[PDB]
Paper text:
The nucleotide-responsive P2Y receptors (P2YRs), consisting of eight members in humans, belong to δ-branch of class A rhodopsin-like G-protein coupled receptors (GPCRs). Purinergic P2Y2 receptor (P2Y2R) represents a typically extracellular ATP and UTP sensor for mediating purinergic signaling. Similar to other P2Y1R-like receptors, P2Y2R couples to the canonical Gq/11 protein, leading to the activation of subsequent intracellular Ca2+ wave propagation. In this study, we determined the cryo-electron microscopy (cryo-EM) structures of the apo P2Y2R in complex with Gq, ATP-bound P2Y2R in complex with Gq or Go, and UTP-bound P2Y4R in complex with Gq.
To elucidate the molecular mechanism of the high constitutive activity for P2Y2R, the structure of the P2Y2R in complex with Gq in the apo state was determined at a global resolution of 3.31 Å. Remarkably, the map revealed a helix-like density at the N-terminus, situated within the orthosteric binding site. We modeled the N-terminal helix segment from T15Nter to R24Nter, as well as the majority of the remaining receptor regions into the final refined map. The N-terminal helix-like segment inclines against TM6, TM7, and ECL3, positioning itself toward TM5 and ECL2, as observed in the overall structure. The conformation of the N-terminus is restricted by a disulfide bond between C25Nter and C2787.25. Specifically, T15Nter deeply inserts into the binding pocket and forms a hydrogen bond with the side chain of Y2686.58 in TM6 and D185ECL2 in ECL2. Furthermore, D17Nter forms a salt bridge interaction with R2726.62, which causes R2726.62 to protrude from TM6 in an unwound conformation. Therefore, the helix-like segment in the N-terminus serves as a ‘built-in agonist’ by occupying the ligand-binding pocket, facilitating self-activation and thereby maintaining the constitutive activity of P2Y2R. In the self-activated state, the extracellular ends of TM6, TM7, and ECL3 in P2Y2R display notable outward displacement compared to the ATP-bound state. Finally, the intracellular end of TM6 exhibits a more pronounced outward displacement in the self-activated state compared to the ATP-activated state.
Residue numbers in the entry:
A (entry chain N): 1 to 126
B (entry chain G): 14 to 50
C (entry chain A): 12 to 62, 207 to 253, 264 to 303, 311 to 321, 332 to 394
D (entry chain B): 14 to 128, 133 to 340
E (entry chain I): 15 to 176, 182 to 227, 239 to 308
Write the structure that this text describes.
């Protein structure tokens, strides 16, 4: 049973930095490509980051390019999303999502409105 | 509804894995003479 | 060898004849998949309709079949595998909405690098170009410095260049991408689809004949 | 309270099938040679289902033609055209005089070939239909991609119940030998045992890592095996309410697309996406002879009711009656 | 050739050295052709499930080339152990007729492949519209019937004289020259023109991966021309375009051009299956 939970993002002032960590359990954490995802008040589900199972292949969305850092660690099933430049409109919600299939970089519903391998999501405010 | 279903199914009657394993052994040892594979 | 057996073989041969006729009439039609966001004028590209909502149109006496799937939920990771023998994926993009454009880029990136669609070429329509012109004449940090290889030209070619970079990041000879700058009042889209599909079939034939 | 259920299932997990099965006469290398290869389909195959007579079987392909074979002589019997070119299911009636299909367009078209055009069309789903299996020639359990199965009725044409318990898309269901229960493997990495009469889930087996593309019941009806996109098939026991054996082997990265049981329930014939189906020992968790005879992906699988043959359709447009 | 011998007696420049190297070249052509064609036959039949017009033609002329390879050892022995002592007159009759029908099959099937490929590269959509497929077998049977029915005069003309004369006879040499000219102009000049127009058309449309395709195209056309034009021009230039003239430096040229171009005419026979399956 896949179950992802995240913590460490409730509230931070616009200046400073914030660290997000998404814990992974119930599956092998070296075959799946993990993406981070956001929501907005009364809006759709965005897309932010990505990192391949190998360890070094990082994609990004334009808005947060250059001010967000993502890292994943194997042998300790968890994800990370370092945020060291906070802006008011990037502080709605930060889900954690996994690409459906292993040994495959093809992810299609990582931002679907009703996804199955997505974390409960951690509320983020600024 | 999810918690309701979890509560409903958490009180289900479960038996030891060994019993089901032995049931499968009996089945696939009794019917092994009539499967042409 | 019997009474019913010979009739059965005759029925089988008749069914084979109908199957052969259907094969002859089937490979001649180039099925097309239409994939566009809600805001994008993917229906406006169908606003030029010429005879799930199929729209069968023929140019120069060769038939194109267009399929757009909208009755399904937004979890197109298992019903898109059905669209594996589609001749080309007509990815329609709204080029005006800058905010929603990143979602279109990500969707195109997912379509491009897919395992099952690794051999499907994509026809990219960046329609509502008139809206783009109106917006520029009246988001992306990559626009700080950029030279086209007026300002509306710079903007449209910037969007096209972003899409092309996404296409060529994992590009290969198996499948190509054909950008276009569609307008809401353009009727030549059929010709553009025709030329793109012609080149796609030409490259498929070149691969088959081992000329490459 | 999911942890409570996990602990309860752990408590009854006092023995392991691999350990219990440590001393049994193994099944030798199974040499299944392609007996027949039925050709005539324009495009790749998507689904099929052996008839009750053990010979006639149906196949539905991308080309938009639903075709009925005769595996003994290979002489076709029917080629019913489709109202939609996209279909991903095939249903056979226990009587053998009804055939169903469906897919995108969300319609479970049902044909009456005991005159062959249409007898009903079930139009209640809001997502692509995945798998439909005839119940009694008058009720047709039907999955769908809108995360809900359904028990239909031919005469009324409307759902008799609705099994809206899943979270992801439903991919495959398998009716019990008793025709009283059935399961459904969804895309949320779970598989729920439903009740036909009660119309409510009775158990959930959340023991997978990704989608579940196929599912089948044990011949006795007290277990079922699932095929995932983790390239691992797992065997679940209804009574023990937990996984028994996982058929996962290294050097296998392609996810399963079909699973079926043998007549004695000894060999799990699982059709993979790695160009070649496999044969797994049901109770030994060991690989028997591989069945590699397809140049494309394997998209379906069906073991005859009497167990005399196993057919493995694939994406090369050919059905092969192994044996 | 009664006059060819005469001059070979007069010019006295007929080197056996080259007559005795001809059999080893023939045997090499035979063995490599047998190997490559056996590999291609096995692949196409017992290791392939998808067939199209191009593959149909490739396999379906590779069978002919394998038959010609299998019949080559008769000629290698004919030329190797001793000069002109065949097992039977009918045997060498069959060998010669098989050589000619193999040459014209290679020409016709290669130009059919070329026409099909040009139809596929020039107008792909409309070419697929009318279904080029399902007609490869018909065109193939047509060309087989054509060559088999049209090479019967080759069978009847050739006869031994003790030996297995390349030409017909002094009495029938006029009809032989007429027949050879007709066969040239019909089954080489027209197919050669067809393949030339075809391949230049695709070259022009491609130049408008492209470099590799043009390279392959030049290689294929060069192979066809190099391995068929020399023999076909040489035979005509040797039969009648030379009559009374006895310039040896040139006669030997014309003659041994013919003799050593016969193996050079068999070259692409063995070289085609590989070039077209790889």
């Amino acid at each position: 049973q896949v179950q992802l939970q995240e913590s460490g993002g409730g509230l931070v002032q616009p200046g400073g930095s914030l660290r997000l960590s998404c814990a992974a359990s119930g599956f092998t954490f070296s075959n799946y490509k993990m993406n981070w995802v956001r929501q907005a008040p009364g809006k759709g589900l965005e897309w932010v980051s990505d990192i391949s199972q190998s360890g070094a292949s990082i994609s990004y969305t334009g808005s947060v390019k250059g001010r967000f850092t993502i890292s994943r660690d194997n042998a300790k099933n968890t994800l990370y999303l370092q945020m060291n430049s906070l802006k008011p409109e990037d502080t709605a919600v930060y889900y954690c999502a996994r690409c459906p299939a292993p040994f495959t970089p093809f992810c299609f519903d990582v931002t679907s409105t009703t996804y199955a391998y997505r974390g409960q999501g951690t509320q983020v405010t600024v | 509804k999810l918690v309701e279903q979890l509560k409903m199914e958490a009180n289900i009657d479960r038996i030891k894995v060994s019993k089901a394993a032995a049931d499968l052994m009996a089945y696939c040892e009794a019917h092994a003479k009539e499967d042409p594979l | 060898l019997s009474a019913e057996d010979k009739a059965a073989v005759e029925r089988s041969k008749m069914i084979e004849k109908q199957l052969q006729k259907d094969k002859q009439v089937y490979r001649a039609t180039h099925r097309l998949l239409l994939l566009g966001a809600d805001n994008s004028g993917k229906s406006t590209i169908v606003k030029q309709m010429r005879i799930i909502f199929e729209t069968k149109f023929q140019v120069d006496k060769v038939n194109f079949h267009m399929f757009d799937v909208g009755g399904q939920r937004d979890e197109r990771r298992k019903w898109i595998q059905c669209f594996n023998d589609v001749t080309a994926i007509i990815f329609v993009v709204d080029s005006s909405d800058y905010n929603r454009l990143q979602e279109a880029l990500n969707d195109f990136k997912s379509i491009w690098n897919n395992r099952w669609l690794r051999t499907i070429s994509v026809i990219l329509f960046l329609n509502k170009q008139d809206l783009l012109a109106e917006k520029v004449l009246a988001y992306f940090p990559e626009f700080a410095r950029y030279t086209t290889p007026p300002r509306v030209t710079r903007a449209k070619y910037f969007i096209r260049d972003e899409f092309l970079r996404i296409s060529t990041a994992s590009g290969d000879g198996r499948h190509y991408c054909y950008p276009h700058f569609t307008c809401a009042v353009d009727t030549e889209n059929a010709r553009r689809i025709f030329n793109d599909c012609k080149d796609i079939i030409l490259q498929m034939n070149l691969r088959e004949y081992n000329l490459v | 309270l999911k942890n409570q259920i996990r602990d309860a299932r752990k408590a009854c997990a006092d023995a392991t099938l691999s350990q219990i099965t440590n001393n049994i006469d193994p099944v030798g290398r199974i040499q299944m040679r392609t007996r027949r290869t039925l050709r005539g389909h324009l495009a790749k195959i998507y689904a099929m289902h052996w008839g009750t007579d053990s010979r006639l079987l149906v196949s539905a392909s991308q080309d938009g033609k639903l075709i009925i074979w005769d595996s003994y002589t290979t002489n076709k019997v029917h080629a019913i055209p489709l109202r939609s070119s996209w279909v991903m299911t095939c249903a056979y009636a226990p009587s053998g005089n009804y055939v169903a299909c469906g897919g995108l367009d969300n319609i479970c078209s049902i044909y009456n070939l005991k005159t062959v055009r249409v007898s009903r069309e079930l139009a209640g789903h809001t997502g692509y239909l995945s798998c439909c299996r005839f119940l009694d020639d008058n009720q047709i359990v039907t999955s769908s991609g809108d995360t809900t199965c359904a028990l239909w009725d031919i005469e009324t044409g409307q759902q008799t119940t609705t099994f809206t318990g899943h979270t992801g898309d439903v991919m495959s269901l398998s009716l019990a030998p008793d025709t009283r229960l059935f399961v459904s493997g969804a895309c949320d990495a779970s598989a729920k045992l439903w009740d036909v009469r009660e119309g409510m889930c009775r158990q959930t087996f959340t023991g997978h890592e990704s989608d579940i593309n196929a599912i089948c019941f044990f011949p006795n009806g007290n277990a079922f095996a699932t095929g995932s996109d983790d390239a691992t098939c797992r065997l679940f026991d209804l009574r023990a309410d937990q996984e028994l054996m996982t058929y996962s082997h290294d050097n296998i990265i392609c996810g399963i697309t079909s699973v079926s049981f043998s007549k004695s329930g000894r060999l799990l014939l699982a059709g993979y996406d790695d160009f070649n189906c496999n044969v797994w020992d049901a109770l030994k968790a060991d690989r028997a002879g591989v069945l590699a005879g397809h140049d494309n992906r394997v998209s379906c699988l069906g073991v005859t009711d009497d167990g005399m043959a196993v057919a493995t359709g694939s994406w090369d447009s050919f059905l092969k009656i192994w044996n | 050739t009664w006059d060819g011998d005469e001059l070979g007696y007069r010019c006295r420049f007929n080197e056996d050295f080259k007559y005795v190297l001809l059999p080893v070249s023939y045997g090499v052509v035979c063995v490599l052709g047998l190997c490559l064609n056996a590999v291609a036959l096995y692949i196409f039949l017992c290791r392939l499930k998808t067939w199209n017009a191009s593959t149909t033609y490739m396999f379906h002329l590779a069978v002919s080339d394998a038959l010609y390879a299998a019949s080559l050892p008769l000629l290698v022995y004919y030329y190797a152990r001793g000069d002109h002592w065949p097992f039977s007159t009918v045997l060498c009759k069959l060998v010669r007729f098989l050589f000619y029908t193999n040459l014209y099959c290679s020409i016709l099937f290669l130009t059919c492949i070329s026409v099909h490929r040009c139809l596929g590269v020039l107008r792909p959509l409309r070419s697929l519209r009318w279904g080029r497929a399902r007609y490869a077998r018909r065109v193939a049977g047509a060309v087989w019937v054509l060559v088999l029915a049209c090479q019967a005069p080759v069978l009847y003309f050739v006869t031994t004289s003790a030996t297995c004369h390349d030409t017909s006879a002094p009495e029938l040499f006029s009809r032989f020259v007429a027949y050879s000219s007709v066969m040239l102009g019909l089954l080489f000049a027209v197919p050669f023109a067809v393949i030339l127009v075809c391949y230049v058309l695709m070259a022009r449309r491609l130049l408008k991966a492209k470099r590799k395709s043009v390279r392959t195209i030049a290689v294929v056309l060069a192979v066809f021309a190099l391995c068929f034009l020399p023999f076909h021009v040489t035979r005509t230039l040797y039969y009648s375009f030379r009559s009374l003239d006895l310039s040896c430096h040139t006669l030997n040229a014309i003659n041994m051009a013919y003799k050593v171009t016969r193996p050079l005419a068999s070259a692409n026979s063995c070289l085609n299956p590989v070039l077209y399956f790889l």
